[PDB]
Design a protein around this ligand. Structure first.
Ligand code: HGX
Ligand code: HGX
Ligand code: FE
Ligand code: FE
Lengths: 286, 286
């Protein structure tokens, strides 16, 4: 006070001087200084400290071997996961912006044909179509687009093991002109889990637990850097308030109402009036 | 980048604007800004983030219902517990400096007489004696000093349930001249638990897990603020490198070698040559 308090923080930071790995040293000295500056800034009480301890403990304890990672959910809801993803995917070009994966990608889904339907359940029919291009605006041929989205129930198959195998998942490909087309249902918004400590924090914050409606993409092609991103429905009431801060301006796409037999359907002939979202992905060379 | 990254952190901080409790708002906005400044400063990689996630998870999972709180141990070893204790016990007077309790205090220990021995086990005999005074240097009469220390094995009774009930614990009292006297054994240094994630972090840091030798005091008297502190052996080889940063300059006390029948033994007549530590505690009025 203020020498006494400063001396405790110096010793804590200095304790790491000896780490053989200088990156680990770097990280721990930074983390300790920030942690101690936080505690000092707010003048954390002992009772508040006990709350932080009970909360962290409960968050770790909510992590099971299996289907629930509450620490990741805490990282997501405090914006750390999206910050980390941006830092590691910095871009100066017009390449499509990235996002986290989320926890819901599944390996070994069906390779689907151009315009193939992946919606095996009820929903509002949609055609999601567009191109995969390079930064010069030329088509990337044979790119692979792995896509996944929740059902109407706000569950991914088989996060929800009751949905059919491969439902609302598929691996599609861009054609000779870089065009792709996916038949699906309009994605719907869904809440993140709130039955753990993260739900308590969101409740105390008066924050809702919703994600805006989205479609997940992972796009790969020889010569290009892997792209993992989301396309978010333009109209979604949660676009400005994504619980995990996934939304970026350029990843929004409008689901337009189109006439039956619209001529601008990537060569498909749609039998009824339908919803359509058009998007051009831009990939970075490697 | 750098707008993109700044926008994610702003949204994460701003998400808490709505908290009904403005203290909770204050704390969470500060914590989020510090957390995001840390991640940005070091440019944390995705693999490092996964390590932080695995580590936090493992720390929470190491907490049992019962005898082990790994999050508290992490708070201690990163200097957060001592920082919190200082912030909440700020003093401008010559009052004795405070420390954390530690996890080892036990209720209902024996009320011991002046100079009573609390060492029921093997060790080097010591007389710890002194006074409890006010800030004006006058004796505090009938103060109660709850004291506890590890055995030679580096365990507290019955953290180590094999030691006798009350071993190296007692509740002593200051007399009409504020004098107290405690017979015990010279405290020995002991390591903190390293079989969990904190041990891994200390290993990576090339930090040892030792505490310098100490005696724990909690002193209470009517009219005065409760004092919880440690007296650390002056000669200890870990005094400058306490794993949990407990040591302060003024809490060190010399265990001097004294002659049999020394006249400066608080009125006790010690039968053999012995170790002696003299300390004057200064309590704050309430
Ligand atoms: C993986 C990356 C992330 C890791 C980063 C590590 C740390 C980040 C995680 C910390 C999150 C802690 C959030 C705790 C939630 C607090 C809470 O839920 O209860 C609220 C009241 O409690 C509080 O106000 C105290 C909050 C204390 C927070 C201290 C955290 C400090 C961490 C350091 C501690 C040790 C290292 C309820 O509000 P109230 O009920 O009073 O609000 C009033 C409104 N009502 C009554 C109508 C509800
Ligand atoms: C309660 C209050 C406290 C709460 C605050 C909340 C957060 C604070 C806790 C974080 C502590 C994390 C410490 C992790 C230990 C890392 C480790 O042990 O392995 C080292 C290598 O790993 C690493 O280098 C990566 C370290 C990554 C740390 C990231 C932490 C960021 C937290 C945010 C994440 C999500 C919110 C081994 O070194 P090496 O083996 O490479 O070293 C080389 C030397 N050898 C090979 C000889 C050993
Ligand atoms: Fe999703
Ligand atoms: Fe101790």
């Amino acid at each position: 006070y203020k020498a006494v308090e400063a001396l405790i923080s110096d010793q804590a930071v200095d304790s790491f001087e000896t780490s053989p790995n200088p990156r680990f040293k770097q990280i721990m000295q930074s983390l300790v200084r920030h942690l101690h500056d936080f505690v000092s800034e707010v003048e954390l009480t002992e009772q508040e400290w006990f709350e932080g301890i009970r909360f962290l403990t409960a968050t770790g304890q909510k992590c099971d071997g299996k289907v629930r990672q509450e620490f990741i959910l805490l990282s997501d809801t405090l914006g750390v996961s999206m910050l980390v993803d941006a830092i590691n995917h910095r871009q100066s070009t017009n390449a499509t912006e990235t996002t986290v994966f989320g926890p819901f990608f599944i390996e070994g889904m069906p390779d689907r044909g151009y315009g193939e339907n992946m919606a095996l359940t009820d929903g509002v029919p949609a055609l999601v179509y567009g191109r995969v291009l390079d930064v010069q605006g030329r088509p990337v041929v044979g790119a692979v687009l792995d896509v996944w989205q929740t059902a109407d129930n706000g569950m991914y198959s088989g996060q929800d093991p009751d949905q059919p195998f491969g439902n609302l998942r598929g691996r599609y490909r861009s054609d000779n002109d870089g065009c792709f087309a996916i038949q699906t249902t309009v994605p719907v918004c869904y809440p993140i889990p709130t039955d753990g400590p993260v739900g308590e924090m969101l409740d105390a914050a008066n924050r809702h637990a919703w994600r805006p409606a989205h479609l997940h993409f992972m796009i790969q092609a020889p010569g290009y850097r892997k792209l993992v991103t989301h396309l978010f429905n333009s109209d979604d009431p949660y676009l400005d308030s994504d619980a995990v801060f996934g939304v970026k301006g350029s990843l929004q796409v409008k689901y337009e109402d189109r006439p039956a037999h619209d001529e601008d359907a990537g060569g498909l002939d749609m039998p009824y009036p339908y919803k359509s979202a058009y998007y051009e992905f831009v990939m970075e060379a490697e």
